Structures are given as C-alpha cells and as structure tokens.
C-alpha cells in the first residue's frame, strides 16, 4: 500500500493579485480512492477540477487537481490528501519560491 | 451419468430434509436446480469443487454441502410448503440427474395410501375387437406420488400399456383432496383367454418413512406397494 | 424470463413436422443448447448451436440459430410418439466455468396417434370383487374427452396406447361412478361422442 | 515512436460493490474516457473517433460494453473459486495497446497486474502467469484459457484492430500532435539542505510538446550540478518542468537559465539572475513566508 506524494505549483510565473491557475498533482499512490482537496485559508474552494485518474509504468495511480485563484502576499493555498496510506491526512501548503 | 437419491420424498413443515446427489463422471463445479410449472429451472446453489459453496439465483430457504468432489447435498433445515418442487441435480458440457420429487405438507394426517382395483374386460370387447382390456383403478392417496406398474406373469410389461399422464382430485373444490389415477393394458383375446395367464396392478406409493411418529387408529401411511390381480379366463 | 419459448404446448399428428421458437435476450451468448425432457425423467441434450449463423441436425432433430436475431428454431422431420415430451430452450452466457445457464419454461409437445380404423366404442368392465368402470376407446384423435359436469362422477382425459406387436394404437378414456343412476351409455354425455359408437347393452 | 496505451483500473470493494474506469493515452494525449458513472466510452478530443465510421466504432463499443459487464463478474466468479486464498478488497489493473514503428511494423501489448504487481499477461493465443508470479494463478488461468471465442477476439484487437485504429488516430490528429506551445520562464531562489548553502530555481512552464532541454550557464560552459526536475502536468495539456542549482552563497551572479525547446526555432530562452527584468519579477512576487518546508 504506497504513500500518496503532492506537488503544488501555478501555470503562469505568479505575479500578486493577478488571475491565475493553480495545480495539485498527486502521484505515486495506491489503491486508487483518494480524496483531494484545496484549500483557501483554511477552508475549502467550492469549485476544484480533477483529471481522469491514470496510472505510470510502475503501476501507481496519479490524479491532476487544479484551480482558478489569485495569488497575494498574504493568502495561504494549500493542498489536502486523504488517503488509505496515512491515518492523518496530508496537507501540503502551496510554497511560491518551490 | 449423475446419481441422485431419493428420487421421491414426503416431510412436514419444519423437518429436516437433505437430497444426496452423486456422480462418477468427474466435474470440478455442480449445481442445484429446481424446476416449477411455467418457469424453467431455477439455480439454488452451485459448488466449484470439493469443500467449497456458494448461493445461487434462489438461496434462500437452502443450504449446500460439498465434501468430496463426487457428493452434493441440498439442505432444508426448516421445511415449507413453498418448497414443494422437482429437484435437478447438474454436473459440469452440463449433465443433469433424473430429479427428485419432494411434496412438502402442512400437516401430516391427511395422507393416505391408494385403493388398487383391477378391472376385466367385457364380452363385447372380446367379441367385437378380438382385443381385451384391464382398466386399472389407485383411488383415494394423497399425496400424489405414485408410479403404476401392469405386471404380467410376475414380469413387467410396456407393450399395450398406458398410464395417465396426471391424477384427478376427487373432489376439486377443495384443496387438499385426495387422488385418483387410471392405467390400461390391451392384450390379444386369444392371450386373455388362457386360464393359465396372470395379471397384477402393482402401484408403488411414496408417504411416510419409519422416521416421522404416528398417533392416529388407522395404520400409518408409509411407502408400500399396493397391488389388485385378475386371472384370464376361458368362460 | 430471459429466455422465452413458443409455442407454449404443441399437437401433432404421428409422423408429421413439428417447429418450435425459442427467443432470448441473454449476453453474451455464447452458445444455445436444446433439451428433451420425458415424463419423470431429467434432461437429455439433443444438439448444440455455436456460431452468430448456426445450423445443426441430429436424427429427426434439426435446429438453426441466429445470434443477431437472439432467435433459434428446432424441427423434427415426421414426429413418433416416442417424441411426447418437453422441449427445453437453455442459452450459455460463457464457454467457461463462470458462466451461467438460463432456462426456458419449455414446450410441451404432444403427438396424437394417427388412427385409420376408428372403432368408437364404450364397454363396462366388472371388479374381481362385485362395482365397475366405463372405458371408452377406440376412437380417432379428432374427439377430446371432456371432464365431469358433476363430482359424483370422474371422467379421465384420454390417452394412447400402442400394441407394438401389431403396429395397432388405440385412445381411451375411463369413466366410473358411485352414484346409482350411473349408465355406462351416458357416462361421456359431457363430451362428443359420434353416431358410429357402440354401446353394448349390460344385461 | 508512438505508444498508444489502454489504461484500465477496476476496485473490487466487496462480493457486492465494484467500480471500472478507463483512460486511453495515445503518445501522452488523453483520447479516451470510459466512467462507471455512464455505459459509454467518451471521446475527449474532436479526432478521438479515428478513422472510422459512426457504425464501425459501436461494434467496438458494443463489444466493450458488453466486456465491462462480463470481466467484472468474471472476476467476482474467480475470487468464489478460490474459497480462502485471497480474498477483498481487490484491485486489477489492464494496460493494453500498440507501439507505433516506421513503415507497417508495429507490436501490441496486454499487460494486467493484480493488487499492485504485474502478474498475467496475453500472449499469442493465451494468458500466461509472468515468470516471478505466485502460483495460484495457474487454476485461475485454466479456466480463463478454455474460453477460445474470447482467446479469439483477444487476438482480434491485438494482431489486427490495435494497428488499424492508431494508424489512423494518428493520420487523422496531425494537426493536434504537431502543435508548438511557447514556454514562459521565471527564475527563484530557497535555503539548501546544507548550511550557508542556496538552491536556484528555473521553472518553464506551458510548452509542447514533452522534448525540452533546461540547463544552468555560466556563459558558454553549462554547470554540471544543474538538476533536471520531473515533468509536472498542466489543465491544458502542456507542460512543466524547473530546473535547480545549488550554488554557495555569494556565487549567484554571473550565472543564467537557458532553455531550448522545437517551439521557439532558434531563439533560447535566457534568463539572466539579478538583471532589471529578474528583479521585476521578484518584487512582483513577495510573500510573508509561512509555511514554507
Ligand atoms: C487491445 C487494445 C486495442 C483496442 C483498441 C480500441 C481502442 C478504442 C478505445 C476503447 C476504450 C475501451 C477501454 C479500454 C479497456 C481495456 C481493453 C483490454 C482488453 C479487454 C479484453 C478483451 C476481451 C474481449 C472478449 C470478451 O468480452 N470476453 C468476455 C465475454 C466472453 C463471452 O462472450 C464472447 C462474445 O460475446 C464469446 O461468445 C465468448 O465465447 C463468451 O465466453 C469474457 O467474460 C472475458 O473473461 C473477459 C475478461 C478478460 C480479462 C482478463 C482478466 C484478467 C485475468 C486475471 C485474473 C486474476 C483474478 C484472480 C483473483
Ligand atoms: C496473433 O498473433 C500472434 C503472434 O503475435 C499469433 O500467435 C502464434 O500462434 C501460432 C498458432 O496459431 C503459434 O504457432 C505461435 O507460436 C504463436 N506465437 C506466439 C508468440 O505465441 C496468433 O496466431 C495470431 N492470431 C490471429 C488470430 O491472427
Ligand atoms: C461493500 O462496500 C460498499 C462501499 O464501501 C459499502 O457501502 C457496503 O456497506 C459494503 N458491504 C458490506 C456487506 O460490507
Ligand atoms: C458501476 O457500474 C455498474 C453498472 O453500471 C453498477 O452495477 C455498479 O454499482 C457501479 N458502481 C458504482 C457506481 O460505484
């Protein structure tokens, strides 16, 4: 049973309060339930987009989430995965400089 | 070919029944069917092979059993009338078993053994057809499992023979009536005319086995054969 | 009720064709197989049908199937009265282990016994004991014997038999009563019964 | 060289509750969806239909209509056939498709792997268990392989049908597949696992297709610590790929990120560390900093 690995990263060079797209791509994981979630500040975006989930020749599931948002100096973005791997579920904040 | 037993029983409301299924031909997987007017045989249970079960379209009421890859077994731990049916045994490209009868009751006090009569046949048939008939007449069993056999000199015949396909309710407006069944035999009038000839109407009925207890004055109703004879005659 | 068949029950007359449908709906469908149950006894396989446009023969038997039309036809060429049984329809989803069977409800077929020498006649037959019956027999397979229009009275449907000795078949039905009104002579007076019939005075 | 995969996963929860997805990738272009949710295939592109007529495609999606249904009651079977040996959840996995080669030739796969590892695979006429596979799979396999009508139409898709319907895919999705996506570039900095040490970051993000190549320079001579990252996925089926550099702190100057991608023709993406323009970025993107690893 292998442990779900998040990446967390923009489409465009993140200019602050400009329209942007943010993507929380997940890999490596299995069996393929799992919950993907991102978050805002705390609290989860209504309207979050996922791919049709896949798998890589070492036959491990990975699942592309992405959403419209708008970067500042203040507000925090962050990916949440629950997974069957983890008791605790994995929260990865959306490090801009990464 | 798959050999099934008993190939005829009756039991209660409530007691408990098995149907014993075997076979030489060796098949992994084996099933339970069971076969009603106006449906086609329906899956009870089926096995893979040897120790293993599983349900099949119509489980419940039923239990399997597989221990060698040979056996098979159909359990009724708690008898209803609903289950009344025929009972196939298949083997598997699927090969299936000669069925089993099982008439299940509500109670037991209303079966009874049949009346075995033989009737011979008249002048005017002699005379006129140089043929002669005997009419054999079971009357007043219930239920209806029985198998009439005409037995001529202490042997079988099928020849100039023929049974009824079903009873009759002698008495149709009520339910749990008892039944009538009627069966021929036409021998040549030359051949009824030898004194020396000899004919039996063996009628084997299915009722109670030595396992299910009895109270009541008349003798018990049990599986048994009952049989009326005529001798030919010169006139 | 996936797998339907008609006619329900079938009459023919000894030696003549006889059709019979089955028409499924079952996926996949790997194979139809048909059935031919006796009276008591289980099932015998009489042919087997395999490919989308399949056609078969076996004896008298000859059955065709059409997979893209979920529809099979099975002929006997000139039926016997050995034939009198139920026709069983089952189509096979695989040609595996992990397939299951779906049944039809069956047909029954009847073939009625062509008899050239009528003879209509109803005869009463005496107990070895003192009681008695009335047998009608004898007669064309053009007449149906209908049931008692009063309980007192039973009336059994008609059957063949076959002296295969002397190549003879012969209908016959037996009726008897307790009453004491009850005439051998107008014991089948529910059913049709010709002009032709002979009714031998008792005394 | 194109690889034109079937990806199918089915999760066995219990004797009862069961789930089959499916994607297809042709090269890394989704061409295919086929949901639980509906009992149709789904084409996520306008040339997903190949070259092929609207009645020549429902014989397909009959078929595999008609597979779904079959392969996971089959399944459920198998699992009754083996009384203790293993037993829920389940998961199986099928990856089956074509590789693509120059002229005619090409060769087909069908590789399925239970709870995880690859296990049983098709071959000519028949399954076989791989070699370095447990045992018990041999009863399974038995079973499966009387089934010559299947056997059968296995082969089909495989020797014939794989080939002729990716042959045409990719005669009939020229116009898609040879598309030049340009890539933008930004350049940034964090701490390094070692102390007094600092990680560069060169991120490209929005070109295709795949093939592209990020190197960090020191004019002419390309540092050789320069490490290629992953290729991240984007919504609108581009790319993403950084490239980083750990330099000792007060050796950043002088140094710059030059990316050479089939979209531009011969001009290089070069971003300079510590020109007007990689200031104007920066400055245009600051943070309070938590939480940051
Ligand atoms: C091959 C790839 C090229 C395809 C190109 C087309 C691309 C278009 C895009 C469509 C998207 C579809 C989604 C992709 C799905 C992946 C495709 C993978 C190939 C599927 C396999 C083909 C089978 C077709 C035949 C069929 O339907 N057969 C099923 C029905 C068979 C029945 O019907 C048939 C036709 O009606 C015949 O009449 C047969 O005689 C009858 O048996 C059969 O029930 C099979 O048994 C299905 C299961 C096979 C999968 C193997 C299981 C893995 C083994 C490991 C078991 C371990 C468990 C132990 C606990
Ligand atoms: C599909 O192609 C395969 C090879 O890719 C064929 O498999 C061969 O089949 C023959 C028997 O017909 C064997 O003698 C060979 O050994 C098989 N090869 C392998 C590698 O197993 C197969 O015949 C083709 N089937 C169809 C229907 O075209
Ligand atoms: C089977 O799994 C489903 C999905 O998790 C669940 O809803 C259901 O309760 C399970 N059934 C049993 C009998 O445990
Ligand atoms: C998947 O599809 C099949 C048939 O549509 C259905 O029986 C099954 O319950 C579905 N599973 C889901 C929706 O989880």
Redesign the interface.
Same mark, same amino acid.
Request: with cysteine.
């Given at each position: 049973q292998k442990t779900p690995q998040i990446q967390v990263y923009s489409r465009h060079p993140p200019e602050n309060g400009k329209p942007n797209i943010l993507n929380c791509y997940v890999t490596q994981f299995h069996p393929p339930h799992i919950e993907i979630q991102m978050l805002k500040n705390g609290k989860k975006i209504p309207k979050v987009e996922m791919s049709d989930m896949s798998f890589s020749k070492d036959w491990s599931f990975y699942i592309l989430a992405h959403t419209e948002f708008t970067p500042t100096e203040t507000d925090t973005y962050a990916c949440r995965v629950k997974h069957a791997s983890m008791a605790e579920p994995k929260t990865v904040y959306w490090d801009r400089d990464m | 070919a798959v050999t099934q037993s008993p190939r005829n029983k009756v039991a209660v409301t409530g007691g408990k029944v098995t149907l014993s299924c075997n076979q030489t031909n060796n098949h992994n997987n084996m099933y339970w069917y069971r076969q009603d007017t106006g449906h086609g045989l329906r899956l009870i249970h089926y096995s893979y092979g040897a120790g293993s079960t599983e349900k099949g379209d119509i489980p419940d009421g039923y239990k399997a059993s597989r221990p060698s890859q040979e056996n098979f077994s159909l359990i009724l731990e708690l008898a209803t009338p609903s289950q009344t049916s025929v009972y196939f045994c298949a083997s598997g490209e699927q090969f299936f078993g000669p069925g089993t009868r099982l008439t299940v009751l509500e109670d037991l006090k209303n079966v009874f053994p049949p009346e075995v009569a033989v009737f011979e046949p008249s002048e005017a048939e002699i005379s006129h057809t140089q043929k002669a008939t005997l009419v054999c007449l079971a009357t007043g069993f219930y239920p209806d499992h029985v198998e009439l056999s005409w037995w001529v000199n202490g042997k079988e015949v099928h020849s100039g023979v023929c049974t009824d396909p079903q009873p009759l309710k002698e008495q149709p407006a009520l339910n749990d009536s008892r039944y009538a069944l009627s069966s021929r035999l036409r021998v040549s009038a030359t051949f009824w005319q030898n004194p020396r000839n000899h004919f039996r109407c063996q009628v084997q009925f299915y009722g109670l086995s030595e396992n299910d207890e009895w109270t009541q004055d008349r003798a018990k109703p049990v599986t048994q054969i009952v049989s009326a004879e005529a001798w030919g005659r010169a006139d | 009720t996936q797998v339907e068949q008609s006619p329900q029950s079938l009459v023919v007359r000894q030696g003549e064709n006889s059709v019979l449908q089955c028409n499924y709906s079952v996926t996949p469908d790997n194979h139809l197989r048909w059935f031919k149950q006796d009276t008591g006894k289980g099932l015998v396989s009489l042919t087997v049908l395999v490919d989308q446009k399949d056609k078969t023969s076996n004896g008298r038997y000859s059955a065709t199937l059409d997979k893209d039309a979920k529809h099979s036809t099975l002929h006997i060429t000139a039926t016997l009265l050995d034939d009198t049984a139920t026709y069983i329809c089952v189509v096979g989803d695989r040609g595996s282990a992990l397939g299951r069977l779906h049944f039809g409800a069956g047909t029954q077929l009847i073939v009625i016994p062509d008899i050239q020498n009528p003879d209509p006649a109803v005869y009463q037959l005496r107990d070895s004991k003192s009681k008695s019956v009335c047998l009608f027999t004898d007669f064309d397979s053009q007449t149906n014997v209908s049931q008692s229009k009063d309980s007192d009275v039973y009336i059994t449907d008609k059957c063949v038999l076959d002296m295969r000795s002397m190549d003879f078949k012969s209908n016959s039905a037996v009726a008897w009563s307790n009453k004491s009104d009850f005439a051998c002579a107008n014991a089948f007076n529910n059913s049709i019964i010709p002009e032709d019939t002979f009714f031998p005075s008792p005394e | 060289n194109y690889t034109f995969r079937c990806?199918q996963?089915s999760?066995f929860a219990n004797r009862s509750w069961s789930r089959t997805?499916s994607?297809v990738?042709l090269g890394d272009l989704?061409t295919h969806?086929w949901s639980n949710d509906s009992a149709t295939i789904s084409f996520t592109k306008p040339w997903s239909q190949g070259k092929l007529s609207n009645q020549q495609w429902e014989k397909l999606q009959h078929m595999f209509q008609?597979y779904r249904?079959?392969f996971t009651?089959?399944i459920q *079977?198998?699992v009754?056939?083996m009384?203790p040996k293993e037993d829920y @959840?389940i *998961?199986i996995?099928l990856?089956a498709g074509c590789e693509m080669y120059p002229g005619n030739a090409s060769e087909s796969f069908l590789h399925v /792997?239970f709870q =995880?590892? #690859?296990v049983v695979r098709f071959w000519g006429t028949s399954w076989q268990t791989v070699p370095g596979a447990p045992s018990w799979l041999d009863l399974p396999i038995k079973?499966?392989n009387?089934?010559? =009508?299947?056997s059968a139409t296995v082969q089909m898709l495989l020797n014939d049908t794989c080939p002729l319907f990716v042959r045409g895919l990719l005669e009939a999705g020229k116009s898609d597949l040879e598309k030049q996506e340009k890539p933008?570039?930004?350049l940034?900095?964090?701490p390094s696992s070692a102390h007094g040490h600092r990680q560069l970051?060169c991120?490209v993000? =929005?070109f295709y297709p795949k093939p592209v190549w990020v190197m960090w320079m020191r004019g002419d001579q390309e540092q050789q610590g320069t490490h290629r990252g992953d290729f991240? @996925?984007? /919504?609108?089926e581009t790319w #993403?790929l950084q490239a980083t550099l750990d330099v000792e702190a007060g050796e950043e100057a002088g140094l710059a990120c030059r990316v050479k991608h089939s979209s531009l023709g011969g001009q290089d993406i070069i971003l300079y560390w510590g020109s007007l323009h990689h200031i104007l970025?920066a400055q245009?993107?600051?943070?309070?900093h938590?939480?940051?690893?």
């Amino acid at each position: 049973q292998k442990t779900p690995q998040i990446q967390v990263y923009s489409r465009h060079p993140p200019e602050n309060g400009k329209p942007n797209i943010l993507n929380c791509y997940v890999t490596q994981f299995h069996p393929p339930h799992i919950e993907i979630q991102m978050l805002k500040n705390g609290k989860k975006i209504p309207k979050v987009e996922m791919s049709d989930m896949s798998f890589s020749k070492d036959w491990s599931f990975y699942i592309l989430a992405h959403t419209e948002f708008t970067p500042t100096e203040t507000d925090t973005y962050a990916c949440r995965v629950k997974h069957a791997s983890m008791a605790e579920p994995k929260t990865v904040y959306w490090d801009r400089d990464m | 070919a798959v050999t099934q037993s008993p190939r005829n029983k009756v039991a209660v409301t409530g007691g408990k029944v098995t149907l014993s299924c075997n076979q030489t031909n060796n098949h992994n997987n084996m099933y339970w069917y069971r076969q009603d007017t106006g449906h086609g045989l329906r899956l009870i249970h089926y096995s893979y092979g040897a120790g293993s079960t599983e349900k099949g379209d119509i489980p419940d009421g039923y239990k399997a059993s597989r221990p060698s890859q040979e056996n098979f077994s159909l359990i009724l731990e708690l008898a209803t009338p609903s289950q009344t049916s025929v009972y196939f045994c298949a083997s598997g490209e699927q090969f299936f078993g000669p069925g089993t009868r099982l008439t299940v009751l509500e109670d037991l006090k209303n079966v009874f053994p049949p009346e075995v009569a033989v009737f011979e046949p008249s002048e005017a048939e002699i005379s006129h057809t140089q043929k002669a008939t005997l009419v054999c007449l079971a009357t007043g069993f219930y239920p209806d499992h029985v198998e009439l056999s005409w037995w001529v000199n202490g042997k079988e015949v099928h020849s100039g023979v023929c049974t009824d396909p079903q009873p009759l309710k002698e008495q149709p407006a009520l339910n749990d009536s008892r039944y009538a069944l009627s069966s021929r035999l036409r021998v040549s009038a030359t051949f009824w005319q030898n004194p020396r000839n000899h004919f039996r109407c063996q009628v084997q009925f299915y009722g109670l086995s030595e396992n299910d207890e009895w109270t009541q004055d008349r003798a018990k109703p049990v599986t048994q054969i009952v049989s009326a004879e005529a001798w030919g005659r010169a006139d | 009720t996936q797998v339907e068949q008609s006619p329900q029950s079938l009459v023919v007359r000894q030696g003549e064709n006889s059709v019979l449908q089955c028409n499924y709906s079952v996926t996949p469908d790997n194979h139809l197989r048909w059935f031919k149950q006796d009276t008591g006894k289980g099932l015998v396989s009489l042919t087997v049908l395999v490919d989308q446009k399949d056609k078969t023969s076996n004896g008298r038997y000859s059955a065709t199937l059409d997979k893209d039309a979920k529809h099979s036809t099975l002929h006997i060429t000139a039926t016997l009265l050995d034939d009198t049984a139920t026709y069983i329809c089952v189509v096979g989803d695989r040609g595996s282990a992990l397939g299951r069977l779906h049944f039809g409800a069956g047909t029954q077929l009847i073939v009625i016994p062509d008899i050239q020498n009528p003879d209509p006649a109803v005869y009463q037959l005496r107990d070895s004991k003192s009681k008695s019956v009335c047998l009608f027999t004898d007669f064309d397979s053009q007449t149906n014997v209908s049931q008692s229009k009063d309980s007192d009275v039973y009336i059994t449907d008609k059957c063949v038999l076959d002296m295969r000795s002397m190549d003879f078949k012969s209908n016959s039905a037996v009726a008897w009563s307790n009453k004491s009104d009850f005439a051998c002579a107008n014991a089948f007076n529910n059913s049709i019964i010709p002009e032709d019939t002979f009714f031998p005075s008792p005394e | 060289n194109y690889t034109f995969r079937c990806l199918q996963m089915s999760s066995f929860a219990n004797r009862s509750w069961s789930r089959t997805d499916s994607v297809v990738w042709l090269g890394d272009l989704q061409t295919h969806r086929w949901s639980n949710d509906s009992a149709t295939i789904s084409f996520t592109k306008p040339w997903s239909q190949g070259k092929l007529s609207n009645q020549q495609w429902e014989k397909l999606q009959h078929m595999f209509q008609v597979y779904r249904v079959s392969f996971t009651r089959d399944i459920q *079977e198998l699992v009754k056939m083996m009384s203790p040996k293993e037993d829920y @959840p389940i *998961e199986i996995q099928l990856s089956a498709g074509c590789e693509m080669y120059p002229g005619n030739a090409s060769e087909s796969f069908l590789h399925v /792997a239970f709870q =995880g590892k #690859y296990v049983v695979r098709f071959w000519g006429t028949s399954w076989q268990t791989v070699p370095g596979a447990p045992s018990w799979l041999d009863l399974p396999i038995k079973v499966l392989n009387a089934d010559q =009508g299947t056997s059968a139409t296995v082969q089909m898709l495989l020797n014939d049908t794989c080939p002729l319907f990716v042959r045409g895919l990719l005669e009939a999705g020229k116009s898609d597949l040879e598309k030049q996506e340009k890539p933008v570039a930004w350049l940034s900095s964090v701490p390094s696992s070692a102390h007094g040490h600092r990680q560069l970051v060169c991120h490209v993000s =929005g070109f295709y297709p795949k093939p592209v190549w990020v190197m960090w320079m020191r004019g002419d001579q390309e540092q050789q610590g320069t490490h290629r990252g992953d290729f991240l @996925p984007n /919504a609108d089926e581009t790319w #993403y790929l950084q490239a980083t550099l750990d330099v000792e702190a007060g050796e950043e100057a002088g140094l710059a990120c030059r990316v050479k991608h089939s979209s531009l023709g011969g001009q290089d993406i070069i971003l300079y560390w510590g020109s007007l323009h990689h200031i104007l970025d920066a400055q245009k993107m600051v943070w309070n900093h938590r939480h940051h690893h």
